[PDB]
């Protein structure tokens, strides 16, 4: 009795709710690039404090999905559009001896170029993947894209790399870090901390697996959705990173035709042709394997693992794909994924690869963009962290994962796991034994 | 409000093979998975795959995984399915439906198709 | 692997009653399963798609709820339409159709 209202300022008591994140990016660089300015982030582990966290449900996750977008189309904005090169293509691509790997050589058309009276002819090289053929005389060929999007050229003087970037959280909204270890991707957190902002992610672009993460505390961690067995991918993310490795040894020609804004186009190759492959680290690869079949067989209790290479689908998603720099990769992967199991540099792998131009954009199709050649021979180098798989179901008795992550946010899902935000509620009140005075 | 039209079907002879087809009609081509399930006559249901239109990714009965095969042409927003050398037991309707899709699951179907009967006989 | 036993074959009533119908897990399948409307040889229609929630547009009389690895549908005024073919579907696991149940006129 006698309990009197009273009131209690900067009170720590907190919501879960949607907001609008800031992004920062670094120092130096190429909204963006001078801007946010580069945090220096601090954090602090709570005593006693039990936070529940969700990876698949947590809003940011498409907030930086819409901003790597925004991001792409501002950049893509001022670069030329190539719709005059939409011309009829008539070539025979039989001129250098190592002619069928590519089979667009001097490729001919007519082009409009310095003065609008005037059609010149021209002729410059394509990987054949960035072509279809018209009816009639296979010489008749076409675009790919270009009866559907329109096509823009990248700005090769903004090109654009995995620059990592900060999320802070506005005043008034605080950032959850989960410390656990062995998360999960759902459950409870006993070790929860907080921070201004989160650490340099960075915007990795690739599919059946990731290059350029952070890695698990533990073991190799296995995240998944657990609403029903019949799930659309699994995440397995790594401990031990492993090295990848890849070339292009090839010397290219860069040629440029003016329509006057500058197109960029492949001219005739120097030097002995290779095609173009990748290495792996052979005892590390199944090794790793045998521990991730080891994780994988504990949810599922007595049943086989086996691994095949994926089936159907575009070439996204049939192939590992990435980026060296200004040049894109689709590699064969079919060695990799096709052990079976049941109830350290030494012989190692090289697998064949493809290159494409023409680059259907990652998020959605119907804009289309190309790459202009990047000059001599190129090799790059990344080291993996985590998987990207789907199960098989129906066949009774064996399951069956297959390399897949084609959708470009479950990158994105799998490196934001540790994060959640929350609104503050600095206003309280509480009952006391004490009133005003008049 | 949401259609999902069919075409082909008729008749197909013993062996032979045969493609169906569905058009989507404007809901949003990338964001749910389509599955093809049939039924016998006399028969309850039963799946026989489920195609991913985004990137194309299919998926099959374990009991019909040399026979059958799907693909998609997202700028038409149109879906095939090949059967290849039908026998007397296919003879039996075959159907499109949308499926309700979460971020990281699937979870059952709302909008049936229109339907396609098909019947095996030489 | 996971099979729907639904039963009864037929159920007969008369209009305005409540009707029950029942679906029989092999074995557990969570709350993931759900219920559809097969008219005549048409498109089937969707009624109840968790364990007891009512799916959008559905008239108020159809219902169903959890019962452990049982699973069963009610509706309480079985009009003169709802005399028709209905089958239960699980998708906590790949996916299974049962043989379905029709409701006809008692007599």
């Known amino acids: 009795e006698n309990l009197w209202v009273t009131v209690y300022y900067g009170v720590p008591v907190w919501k879960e709710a949607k907001t609008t994140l800031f992004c920062a990016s670094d120092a130096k660089a190429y909204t963006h690039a001078c801007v946010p300015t580069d945090p220096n982030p601090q954090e602090m582990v709570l005593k006693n404090v039990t936070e529940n966290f969700n990876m698949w449900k947590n809003d940011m996750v498409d907030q930086m999905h819409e901003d790597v977008i925004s991001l792409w189309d501002q950049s893509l904005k001022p670069c030329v559009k190539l719709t005059p090169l939409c011309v009829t293509l008539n070539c025979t691509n039989a001129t250098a001896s190592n002619s069928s790997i590519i089979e667009g050589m001097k490729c001919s058309f007519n082009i409009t170029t310095e003065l609008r009276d005037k059609r010149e002819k021209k002729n410059a090289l394509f990987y054949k993947l960035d072509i279809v053929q018209l009816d009639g005389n296979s010489s008749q060929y076409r675009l790919i894209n270009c009866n559907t999007s329109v096509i823009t050229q990248a700005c090769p003087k903004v090109s654009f790399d995995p620059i990592p970037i900060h999320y802070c959280a506005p005043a008034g909204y605080a950032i959850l870090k989960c410390n656990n270890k062995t998360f999960t991707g759902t459950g409870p957190c006993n070790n929860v901390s907080t921070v201004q902002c989160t650490h340099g992610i960075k915007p990795v672009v690739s599919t059946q697996l990731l290059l350029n993460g952070s890695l698990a505390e533990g073991e190799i961690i296995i995240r998944s959705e657990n609403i029903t067995k019949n799930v659309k991918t699994i995440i397995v993310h790594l401990n031990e990173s492993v090295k990848i490795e890849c070339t292009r040894p090839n010397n290219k020609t860069r040629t440029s035709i003016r329509i006057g804004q500058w197109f960029y186009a492949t001219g005739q190759v120097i030097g002995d042709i290779r095609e173009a492959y990748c290495n792996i680290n052979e005892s590390k690869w199944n090794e790793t394997l045998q521990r991730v079949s080891k994780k994988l067989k504990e949810y599922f209790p007595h049943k086989n693992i086996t691994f095949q290479p994926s089936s159907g689908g575009d070439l996204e998603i049939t192939t590992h794909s990435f980026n060296c720099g200004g040049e894109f990769f689709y590699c064969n992967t079919s060695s990799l994924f096709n052990r079976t199991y049941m109830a350290n540099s030494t012989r190692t792998i090289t697998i064949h690869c493809r290159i494409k131009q023409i680059i259907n954009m990652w998020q959605e199709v119907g804009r289309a963009m190309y790459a202009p050649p990047i000059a001599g021979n190129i090799t790059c180098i990344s080291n993996i962290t985590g998987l990207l798989l789907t199960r098989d179901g129906g066949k009774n008795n064996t399951e069956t994962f297959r390399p897949g992550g084609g959708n470009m946010k479950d990158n994105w899902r799998s490196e934001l796991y540790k994060y959640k935000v929350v609104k503050i509620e600095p206003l309280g009140v509480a009952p006391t034994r004490c009133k005003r005075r008049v | 409000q949401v259609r999902l039209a069919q075409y082909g079907g008729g008749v197909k002879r013993l062996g032979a093979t045969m493609t169906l087809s569905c058009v989507a009609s404007?809901?949003?081509?990338?964001?749910?998975?389509i599955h093809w399930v049939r039924q016998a006559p006399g028969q309850g249901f039963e799946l026989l795959g489920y195609?991913?239109?985004?990137?194309?990714?299919?998926d099959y009965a374990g009991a019909l995984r040399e026979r059958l095969s799907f693909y998609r042409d997202k700028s038409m927003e149109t879906l095939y399915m090949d059967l290849r050398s039908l026998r007397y037991d296919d003879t039996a309707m075959y159907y499109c439906?949308?499926?309700?899709?979460?971020?990281?699951?699937?979870?059952?179907?709302?909008?049936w198709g229109s339907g396609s009967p098909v019947i095996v006989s030489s | 692997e996971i099979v729907l036993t639904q039963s009864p074959a037929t159920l007969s009533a008369s209009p305005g009653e409540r009707v029950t119908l029942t679906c029989r897990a092999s074995?557990?399948?969570?709350?993931?399963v759900a219920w559809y409307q097969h008219k005549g040889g048409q498109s089937p229609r969707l009624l109840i798609y968790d364990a007891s929630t009512r799916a959008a547009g559905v008239p108020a009389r159809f219902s169903g709820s959890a019962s452990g690895t049982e699973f069963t549908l009610a509706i309480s005024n079985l009009e003169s339409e709802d005399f028709t073919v209905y089958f239960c579907?699980?998708?906590?696991?790949?996916?299974?159709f049962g043989q379905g149940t029709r409701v006809d006129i008692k007599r």
């Open positions: 439906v949308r499926n309700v899709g979460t971020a990281g699951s699937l979870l059952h179907y709302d909008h």
């Open positions: 404007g809901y949003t081509f990338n964001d749910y998975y």
């Open positions: 074995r557990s399948v969570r709350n993931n």
């Open positions: 195609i991913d239109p985004a990137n194309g990714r299919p």
């Open positions: 579907l699980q998708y906590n696991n790949w996916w299974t």
